[PDB]
Assembly symmetry: D3
């Protein structure tokens, strides 16, 4: 379980999955990733295919986490965690929490990680509010999308964007909630770890595959003469 | 067209596709690859999915080549080329050639590249025979699979295996047929190009993705402390 | 038609379908069931697969009923009935009714059973209200889910839960509406039939299949020595 | 691009697609249609199938337009336009417009035609309101569905229905917005073109295919004796 | 049943299906066709999709006939008939016959029409041979494909091709076997019917749909000015 | 592993799977079955669906065995065993064995159970021959299909059919090969176990589900009055 790793002092490393293919899931698992975030928000993916991917993740012994926007269905498929994007108010979080629990004291019939991602400045302002919900386990930083929402390209990582992120960690960590970082560089990892952060999402598969392939091919032509 | 590139003095670069997902096809096209070899031999892939991939390749402006073992169906799907594995005798090639042509003087109803891959030592012995069929455009070297067929791991690339490969090029090039190389290193490319070789397949997507991801993740943990 | 059976004094027997496979549908039809309730609420099922199941039910001559939560789409697929879960207020029912009718006096373009299931105590309180909508044909008792919503395990069927159910029948039957029971035992059937009840749902396929198989296998090992 | 045609003085002809098959898309493209309106409102169609159709349209060089009711997902699939049905208020249009734009000044991440269809009399009354949104490119007349919403069969095309349609064009054309007509006869085309209309949707594939086939078969039996 | 129609003196009309979509099947059935020939030879179609189409044909009350090249699987799917293409020798027919029968005296486990199509001149020469197999019910003329196999375009329907066809009927009809014609014109129907022919396949859906659509659209532009 | 169970003195119980749905697989696993025989011979099942089922079996911790008639593909999908039907000669077995092994000394690239099923009297006669192949692990009795092949209904289990079966065990057990029985009654299990038999297939899911459901429903109506 993902909690189970975090309670042992373990660092866990994950990646976004933009390609709804079971072989890609098995490839990620073989690469050493502790979990994979199956992104259903920006992927045209059938419900049965999502179930296929969750089964594939389990058979490959990699933790299936699904980024949603039907919460019941995904959790009924066997997802061990739910990342909810663009969380602004606390109303959203408490509703998600009881969407993931049993009747009578929930809206689901018969240790899943309830995760909220902060990607709008509104979510940053209500962070003290948001990060105290009973049921919320993890809060994921989304500095890039947050930057883009402020009319500021993430390419120039301004101080204000970074300030909003560090303010998120401090608040989240103050209530004993888990923090998850999205480091752009591999040395931002060591910086977060020293602060106590254990959970890290390292980009998305489609993004890293394009970068490696196009560059490797470029060198292949370059070396060819 | 692939011939059309080869007739202009152009070098063309391709890759094996082990993941039957249209997004992977579009990723390969965006990486700069001139063609993609959709491998249907070692991929559990539905016939409608294969058609989906060929459409995806066309919309991404990358040349669809299918490695088979139903030749009609694939060619009816819009594949611009057929790579046939484990070709040993000439009987096979001539049959494939007329499987790709019109009635009356073919077995197909209403510039596709007819490609044969040499992966067994039997194919190496009948190479002078094989590489003269009217209709055969390209012969693909498969040194690794050939090595494995000789009870010799490809990890140790022996002289005999390399000798069988260079004998293939010389014979194939003598009859004005196209040669396609599978370089293990990027400097084997320059060596083939100096001999006149224009077509190159650079590994398989699944293989390169595993190698990049697992290593990048390893460095990510390494840098983390 | 399902109404057509009910207007003839016929008893009709159905079952919940938790396995979105056309063969399972055909198996249910061959077992003698008058209808099958394709459960789309707790089944990861593609929209095209649901259409496949409805076609399969029709070709097997078994009445297709779909339990929803897109009402138009299901009815456009050929479903002869709609079971709506967790109905609490009357506002819901009247909206469903006109979701199943023609323009101008509906929200659907060009004898379908409109069915509401009571599973929350709120639905029990508004039962006199709910069971008088023009357009509502059937009301399905859901004692188990109702029990679970009251913090009471259905395993102990308390008097209060049973009281809420019998109060539902009396009210529903008073307005000439059809009642559908979910008997836990096969002798609860005779009791409902004596009251005039004609419609019965006998569990779910997945539930009965697990119970039969696991027990039969257990006896198989037991007999083996 | 569709705008690009309209800015050149070109007339463009499209058709509704009720059959979610890539071959049907390719058939439409080969018939000479400039665009095809993939109708997802009254078609049981998987999300991955919709992506398949958009790829098929692109490879067949026909413009993919999707009629919706997930706007992000369709636009992420590569749709060049969105037709939104039953637009009544302006609130709807402005929301759709910013659903199709970038953050910060939209709700979509990283020349698409924003199209609204008028099918209710409410949409006709708010037409001066609706047809001035910054971001709205085209307004599609839907006289038949509008007729059916007024308790009047479209079979008798009354003056009032036709009046509501001509009032739509005049208002829409006054704000420099594109008008799209649904002519029942082929001579209603010349009438709209003289008014400046360039965009025309000629029925739906399923409708025209049934009409041609059933009639042709009827003549086939008739001629047979 | 198809035999059942033929034994009553009924004429039956069918069409080739090149589009593996259940809606297309239902469209054909609604057009009045007695049967539909699901062409699996030149259609990329999954096995589960073929089963979907057979179910769709049954629910639409149109006879499912499948043109193959796995005979067991199709017959296990519920196909009421099998059309086998390019039959040359009698060995083929007798094998197909016992592929469609029960063990012990067949190769299939637990009134299907066994149909052979003549499309090569070899099949024409062995017609007296072929058309006497115990188990063979129908022989389908394929003049066009036969013409194309003789290096002669079907566009010019020569006397020799027509002679081979009329020789087929005479032989087939002499052994009390059913004849099926593929008339290019609707008056070739009356000619065959006078000879006793009852079964007629009128082109393919994809072919007729392209012809109607492209022409209708052409007139639409023509009328527009 | 299945061998691993058999080498420990463990009895293993399996069932035939006629319904290609992952939920059915998970239901079988939960019922306590040690393995499931995914029957691809009499099931319309896509190749990707078969891969889905194998993943589902692994995630449910039940051993995936596939009954075939593409051996490479299934084994590449992760099947832990292959049951080959209607084995008559030894030529078949030796070919299957080296279809499941590595190059050079096989036809497969980079503890799987190689299983042969005897269902024809020809297989019974060559049993001393068949059951000595190096590579063949298990031989499955198929008395019913064998009976049906002898023009004898399995409903009357004659002495000759039973004699052919007991002759199979004796021969198979003499060469230290694994025997797998298909008991019609649960007390035929104890009889085989006393002879040393450890592997048992208890019918098929579809068969047992029909029998339980139709009977249970019958009692439900019977009890109802
Ligand atoms: O909704 C139903 O019909 C019952 C159920 O499983 C729930 O959602 O609590
Ligand atoms: O086989 C047929 O029925 C006709 C055809 O298109 C071919 O294969 O030449
Ligand atoms: O919405 C549309 O475009 C037309 C239609 O069939 C409806 O929903 O009444
Ligand atoms: O929602 C997210 O996680 C990020 C994103 O691509 C967006 O929707 O702006
Ligand atoms: O092949 C089998 O395993 C049994 C069977 O149904 C057949 O093909 O006669
Ligand atoms: O066939 C190929 O192209 C190579 C391969 O993996 C094999 O089958 O040994």
């Amino acid at each position: 379980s993902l909690k189970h790793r975090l309670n042992n002092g373990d660092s866990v490393y994950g990646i976004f999955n933009s390609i709804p293919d079971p072989l890609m899931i098995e490839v990620i698992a073989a690469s050493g990733y502790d979990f994979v975030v199956i992104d259903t928000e920006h992927v045209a993916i059938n419900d049965e295919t999502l179930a296929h991917l969750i089964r594939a993740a389990e058979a490959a012994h990699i933790i299936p986490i699904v980024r949603v926007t039907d919460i019941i269905k995904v959790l009924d498929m066997g997802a061990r965690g739910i990342i909810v994007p663009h969380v602004k108010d606390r109303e959203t979080v408490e509703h998600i929490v009881k969407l993931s629990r049993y009747y009578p004291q929930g809206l689901r019939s018969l240790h899943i990680m309830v995760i909220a991602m902060i990607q709008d400045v509104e979510g940053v302002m209500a962070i003290d509010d948001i990060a105290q919900v009973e049921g919320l386990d993890m809060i994921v930083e989304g500095a890039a999308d947050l930057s883009q929402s402020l009319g500021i390209p993430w390419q120039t990582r301004d101080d204000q964007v970074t300030s909003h992120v560090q303010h998120i960690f401090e608040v989240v960590n103050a209530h004993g909630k888990h923090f998850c970082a999205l480091p752009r560089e591999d040395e931002d990892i060591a910086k977060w770890q020293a602060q106590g952060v254990q959970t890290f999402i390292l980009g998305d598969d489609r993004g890293k595959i394009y970068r490696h392939l196009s560059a490797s091919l470029a060198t292949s032509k370059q070396k060819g003469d």
